[model samples]
Target: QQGITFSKNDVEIIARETLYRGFFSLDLYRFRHRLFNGGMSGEITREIFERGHAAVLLPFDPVRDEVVLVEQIRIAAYDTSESPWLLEMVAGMIEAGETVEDVARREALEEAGLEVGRTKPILSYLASPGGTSERLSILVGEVDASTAKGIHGLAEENEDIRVHVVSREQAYQWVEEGKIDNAASVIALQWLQLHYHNLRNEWTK
Candidate 1:
């Protein structure tokens, strides 16, 4: 939330190029821009593209004193020599005609195999502000992690997700040891560390 406000003008979509045509649409757009307050004046910004999508992360547990996380293979990291699979919080893209809370609950069941209870909104913000305009909403809830297990995912969509339950100490240790590499998982875990105590105290009563 830091920068000077610049007026957007001459807004026109030059050409739309589809990068991926499947569940979501990724397009590259060429547009014009003019800066009003920056040191560079009368400069035109070229090749501005936008990728539209809504992503949400679910952080919750089935019972008290436990946290739920999901494990899946990341295609982008598969080429990397370090690690291809990643341990992360439950998350998915918000489909059309679905609210944020609805997506959160749905992903919890799909990815973690647990029904979420009493969702608490944590925060909402843009995931990446540089090139793509991706917005993400995060939520936390309670679940029975003791009985939660197995590799659960949407078979129709060809998704294979593994769920894991770990204590608060274990979660923290994973973060400290650089195990949880995803951005949403890291952010949600840090938020939980700061607010979980208060959330539990208020919900228990």
Candidate 2:
């Protein structure tokens, strides 16, 4: 397999600046690239940016065959002049020295108060590549409904998250009704709908 190749001469970074600095740093890249094909050559230049990686977890209830979603206030959406808070899957940044699975288990307990059993690997992808390099790795795990609860959040983080446990039918209905307005939750629920039977069988064992 051939990978993307770029040379210093082939690409130039016109300007670089940092937008924000925290656990992750956001940087803007102004650059140009040269491209060539069979008997054709072109020069292309553009400004691009990227973000850092964290992790996300989608908590699934095996007993009830439903997914647990969290609703919280999102500052970023405040400027939209609409309902800023959104219904999203339980997610958090992967801190240093924490494995992805560990983060998944922790988030399950923190956000929804659920104890996860077996986790099934879903897919990993870039969240926003055009202006941000935020990559997200998501997993769907089998959880015990006996332990699932609501309105659980971390007080130290000032997080007031409402955990909702709904049936698979209700989840799909929300997607159809456009109630699930977040990307991660939407994708995760759709995956569950598509492979519900298979996932149920695997998790039951």
Candidate 3:
């Protein structure tokens, strides 16, 4: 929630070259920025993967103390990783004209077969600022854990997502055991573990 601000003139983009553009786009850029010590720094060039932004939702049932997770194949995932199918909270890319909360609600249904209630914005973050322009919003929402069942995802999108409902404690255990390696889920679960008691109290009412 804290950061140092730079003037609009602090950074200047000299040139940009598109390297690739398909499902996702990539560009190489040359730029210069003011240094903290003073003066402008030498020109720096970097490649960026542009996929825009996304919305991630963590659905929880305070009454049952359960969390909904989705398991799906991540093609770019490490081969030796604990599992190629990443276990993560429901997420989807933000489409044109759609708000982050709308994406959160839609993905919760498509990916977990769960309808969310009373969404609470947790935070927003860049997935990988060094190489990607993908920003993501993390939201915690009330869900009926009992309804989070079966496989879900868009057939046209070639998505095959499996939903898993587990105790919040078990979910946190998965994080500790490395079963949950995805960034958003890890951050959300850790946040829940710290504030669940109070959150549950208010949510249940």
Candidate number of the best TM-score: 3
Which segments of candidate 3 are over 4 A away from where they belong? 1-5
Cα error, residue 35 of model 1, in Å, equals 3.1
TM-score of 1: 0.80
Candidate 2: tens digits of C-alpha lDDT, residues 59-158: 8876678878888998887886367778888887777798778888898888888788888777787876776677778899888755667688898989
Best of the candidates, lDDT: 3
The clash numbers for all candidates, in the given order, read 5, 2, 0
lDDT preference between candidates 1 and 3, better one: 3
Q: Rank the candidates by TM-score, best first.
A: 3, 2, 1
Off by over 4 Å in 1: 1-26, 32-51
Give the per-residue lDDT of model 1 (tens digit) for 47-165.
32344545555555524667877888888777752787888877778767898888888888888788876888878877667666678788887777786789998989888988888
Q: For candidate 3, write residues 68-99 as lDDT tens digits.
A: 99999997776769658899999999999999
Show the colliding residue pairs in model 1.
Answer: 61-143, 62-143, 62-144, 63-143, 63-144
lDDT (0-100) at residue 39 of candidate 1?
44
Deviation from native of the Cα of residue 189 in model 2, angstroms: 0.9
- Which model, 2 or 3, shows the larger TM-score? 3
Per-candidate TM vs. native? 0.80, 0.82, 0.94
Cα lDDT for residue 197, model 2? 89
